[PDB]
From Swiss-Prot, chain A:
One of its GO terms (molecular function) is structural constituent of ribosome. Belongs to the universal ribosomal protein uL30 family. The lineage of its organism: Eukaryota, Fungi, Dikarya, Ascomycota, Saccharomycotina. This is Ribosome biogenesis protein RLP7. Involved in the biogenesis of the 60S ribosomal subunit. May act as a specificity factor that binds precursor rRNAs and tethers the enzymes that carry out the early 5' to 3' exonucleolytic reactions that generate the mature rRNAs. Present with 7720 molecules/cell in log phase SD medium. It is found in: Nucleus, Nucleolus.
Swiss-Prot record, chain B:
Component of the large ribosomal subunit (LSU). Mature yeast ribosomes consist of a small (40S) and a large (60S) subunit. The 40S small subunit contains 1 molecule of ribosomal RNA (18S rRNA) and 33 different proteins (encoded by 57 genes). The large 60S subunit contains 3 rRNA molecules (25S, 5.8S and 5S rRNA) and 46 different proteins (encoded by 81 genes). It is found in: Cytoplasm. Transmembrane segments: none annotated. The chain holds residues 155 to 205 of 256 of the full protein. Belongs to the eukaryotic ribosomal protein eL8 family. Disulfide bonds: none annotated. The lineage of its organism: Eukaryota, Fungi, Dikarya, Ascomycota, Saccharomycotina. This is Large ribosomal subunit protein eL8A. It comes from Saccharomyces cerevisiae (strain ATCC 204508 / S288c). Present with 238000 molecules/cell in log phase SD medium. Component of the ribosome, a large ribonucleoprotein complex responsible for the synthesis of proteins in the cell. The small ribosomal subunit (SSU) binds messenger RNAs (mRNAs) and translates the encoded message by selecting cognate aminoacyl-transfer RNA (tRNA) molecules. The large subunit (LSU) contains the ribosomal catalytic site termed the peptidyl transferase center (PTC), which catalyzes the formation of peptide bonds, thereby polymerizing the amino acids delivered by tRNAs into a polypeptide chain.
Curated annotation (Swiss-Prot), chain C:
It is found in: Cytoplasm; Nucleus, Nucleolus. It comes from Saccharomyces cerevisiae (strain ATCC 204508 / S288c). Residues 4-82 form the RRM domain. Keywords: Cytoplasm, Nucleus, Ribonucleoprotein, Ribosome biogenesis, RNA-binding, rRNA processing. One of its GO terms (cellular component) is preribosome, large subunit precursor. Disruption phenotype: Essential gene. Abrupt growth arrest prior to substantial depletion of ribosomal subunits. Fails to synthesize the 25S and 5.8S rRNA components of the 60S ribosomal subunit, and exonucleolytic 5' processing of 5.8S rRNA is strongly inhibited. Arrests at cytokinesis and fails to assemble a contractile actin ring at the bud neck. This is Ribosome biogenesis protein 15. The chain holds residues 88 to 220 of 220 of the full protein.
Swiss-Prot record, chain E:
Disruption phenotype: Essential gene. Reduced assembly of 60S ribosomes and accumulation of halfmer polyribosomes. It comes from the Eukaryota. It is found in: Nucleus, Nucleolus; Nucleus, Nucleoplasm. Belongs to the pescadillo family. Induction: Expression is down-regulated prior to the diauxic shift. This is Pescadillo homolog. Residues 1-282 are annotated as: Sufficient for interaction with ERB1. Component of the NOP7 complex, composed of ERB1, NOP7 and YTM1. The complex is held together by ERB1, which interacts with NOP7 via its N-terminal domain and with YTM1 via a high-affinity interaction between the seven-bladed beta-propeller domains of the 2 proteins. The NOP7 complex associates with the 66S pre-ribosome. Also interacts with NOG1. May also associate with the origin recognition complex (ORC complex). Present with 4530 molecules/cell in log phase SD medium. Component of the NOP7 complex, which is required for maturation of the 25S and 5.8S ribosomal RNAs and formation of the 60S ribosome. Residues 185-271 form the BRCT domain. The chain holds residues 88 to 460 of 605 of the full protein. It comes from Saccharomyces cerevisiae (strain ATCC 204508 / S288c) (Baker's yeast).
Amino acid sequence: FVRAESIVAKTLATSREKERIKRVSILEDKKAKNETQHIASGKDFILKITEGLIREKTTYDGKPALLFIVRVRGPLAVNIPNKAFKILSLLRLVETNTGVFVKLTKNVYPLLKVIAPYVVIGKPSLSSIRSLIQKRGRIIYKGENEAEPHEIVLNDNNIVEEQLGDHGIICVEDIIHEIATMGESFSVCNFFLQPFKLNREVSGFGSLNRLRKIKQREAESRTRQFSNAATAPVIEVDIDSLLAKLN
Amino acid sequence: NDVDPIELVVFLPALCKKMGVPYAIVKGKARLGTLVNQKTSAVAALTEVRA
Amino acid sequence: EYSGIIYVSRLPHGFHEKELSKYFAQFGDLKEVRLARNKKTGNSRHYGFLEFVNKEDAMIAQESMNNYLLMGHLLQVRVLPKGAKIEKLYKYKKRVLVEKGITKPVKQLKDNMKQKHEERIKKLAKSGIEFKW
Amino acid sequence: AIPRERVIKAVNELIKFTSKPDDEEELKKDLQLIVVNNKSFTGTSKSFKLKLLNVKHSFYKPWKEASATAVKDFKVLLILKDSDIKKVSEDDLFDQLDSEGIKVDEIICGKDLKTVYKAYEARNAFISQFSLILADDSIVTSLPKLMGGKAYNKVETTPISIRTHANKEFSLTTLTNNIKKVYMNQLPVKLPRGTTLNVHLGNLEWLRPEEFVDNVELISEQLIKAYQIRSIFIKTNRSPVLPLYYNQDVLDELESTFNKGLMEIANP
Amino acid sequence: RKLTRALGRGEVSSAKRLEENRDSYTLDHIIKERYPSFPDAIRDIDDALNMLFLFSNLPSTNQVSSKIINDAQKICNQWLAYVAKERLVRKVFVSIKGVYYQANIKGEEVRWLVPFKFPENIPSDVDFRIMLTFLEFYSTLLHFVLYKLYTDSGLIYPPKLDLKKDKIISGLSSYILESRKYDSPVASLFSAFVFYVSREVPIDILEFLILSCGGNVISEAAMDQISKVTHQIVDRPVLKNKVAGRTYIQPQWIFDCINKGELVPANKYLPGEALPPHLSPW
RNA sequence: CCUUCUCAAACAUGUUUGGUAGUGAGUGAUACUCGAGUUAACUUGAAAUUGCCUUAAA
């Protein structure tokens, strides 16, 4: 059975999400034309939240940056709109506990503004990148005797040498180098790597785990903010500590 | 509703009706106890509420 | 006596035609679902009608949701008498404004506004309001 | 712009029309300025932001000094941010606005609006009792959902934005300066999506006819440089319109980075 | 049971207080009962080291938690830092399963296995609860042994770690060891040597071996985040231009020199020539 | 049984510009601009009978 309260709550939340995405899209069209006489703000803001918590709202310099994007569960009782679903599917974030690397530029900022309530966005450090690749590194590889390809771990450097060696990538360390430095064949390496399947920090349904879930929800509510303001800064959190808990 | 001995609340609906007090019979003295931080509670009352 | 027609009122903001259909198809098959909406703005008038294939299903839905407290709204559900087919409840959209053409030439419309000003002057003179020109 | 003798005669005639010998003894003595534009004022976009027109003479001080014999007396509401509501108190406004005779009865915030006055009846009862509602320009954009659409059907209940932040921090001095400026020098006007715009100059007993003449002349002189107006009228309630302006030349004005980002984030 | 009662009643603050006002069991008395002698503990820590290095390499799952894995990695890094600083390694053998190290700790030969930094798949067929119980016991035992070893050497236990070096390369170099000649020739090898380890080379293995047989290591991988160089350790089929003042070699030279004890001549170890067999030291 | 655009630039604490699209129903006066768009102010329980992604899981 389905309750009328659940139906109406889903309807209202989905309508507000659609309103937010529509306003963001209108602002982004105005910014793309870049000559509109009437606009609230015409620049990109980054809200870095660190730890009792401190938030710095800076501008976006415009230079490319490296981001790690983690798909988290979205707002409650919200049917995901088509635009956000399209961007998440293109980013390969169809399911939660899944992470990707993104090269952020001026044309990447509006997509992050659109998909803000469904992802945690951070700046990954070198140690976190290396731990992520050496701990959870998977590829879709087609064996010569295999009728259909399957997903195996990134265990052999010979496979890397025979798939990306022509681009100049011989090993996992070279993949790590290109991902970290945002250099040549960054897209090639980032799509050779499968999306990273992280494990949940709190799992189970005993009393200890339910109390830990309560604490985790409290912490996430304190950290993450839903501005719904059509000019909201992209929020950057401590992805190092997040990946330390998730891996 | 599940008060034993029942005489402790058997007069309460009639008293509430005579005094014009809105009342409701609910299932669970244990539920009322969780309301008032007790194991059980035979009754609960809202007297003054916030704006 | 009684029909298979249900009148619902004191609806919340999010309760619309598809929501009512999805909720009451659980109670039974629905011939038609309509919602009273405003003509110029796309806003609900907080009431509507539904029609069950089975009047028994309509009566069950009424005795189920007659006084249902929902998001601060105490819903009201009535079973309509025999007949009274639901009609003239169009799903309006949000209308918009747009400037049309003006076939009157500039000279004609300026002359018309000057004649209107003269008529205002005549009205002021008739009223005993001594305004110049 | 507007002839002084013409506007003096118009104001004298309108004040003479009321004093020929319910709410009939209160609403029929309100002076209104009608401005008729060639095209739509704001355009195709509905506007809820009130335009502030700055004048020489005070407008709310006569309202306060005349509300002593009014059933609905003069009231000012101040709206501030949730993080800013704890930095100020009623003494901090009294000591800074007592010199000019400015009093703020109630200060609320968005949390107060969303919790205390969530219900429509309580919200209407709270909103309708104030005559000048001022809001921080930070929180003014959320107010169509908080104060509702019934609060925007009147000029006096439509919120006014003020600049309470100086150098990206809330400043009591800047707040008081903006409040004083709004109270003394400027007036609120509703810009419509049509062509007919209404300005409430106030009551006939609030100010002298000379003050009304000076205020309306300054309003016309500012509005001419603001927008290309077409016609100007002065009226009282239940009275016709007295024209004051006529011009001709303003009439003849009648006659993929999204896909770039998708390409950047997609490999094939 | 009482926490379940608090959560069921909806008293979340009381549940938090109940969770805070609890004390877990410890295994120190069991450690002292089972190992009356520090040499006995030293002669039994081999399986403990193997299990800890295995569990420091796994990814977090539903059964194996990030806190447990991070604690195991921390204690493994402490052990590696102590061995590197006291310069106690004697034998190294790189087999396809992993790297077998043999170090002389207090006159006792201790051999352990370290897997490579690759994502090994979990069989989902093993008794993980039994293995985690063994991991708890091994962690307590190695805490006791590491405290005794650090205090005997005259160092602070536990040593503080450097946050920036931890965020650059999370290895044994992040733990700086503070206080308050070695035995020839394995420790004396690579003295006044600076090795530029190239990107393709396993940095943890090479750096630990060199630092245990003391020398300086400059890592090409660590330079990604942003003169005195003598040797450069590379492993590539095609090498670019070489500086005339730097000796270029392959990682097997380090292993063979460590197992030989002497300085095996490097003319046989070149990037463009075949290597001699990597013989087992046992 | 969800929870609301809580702000920006530019010049010297001041000045300018931009940012706000609403519960429904009803009463009403009065003028203005080409069946359309505006204009004083009054009522009401959140009122009402029909204008063709899934470990927020069992």
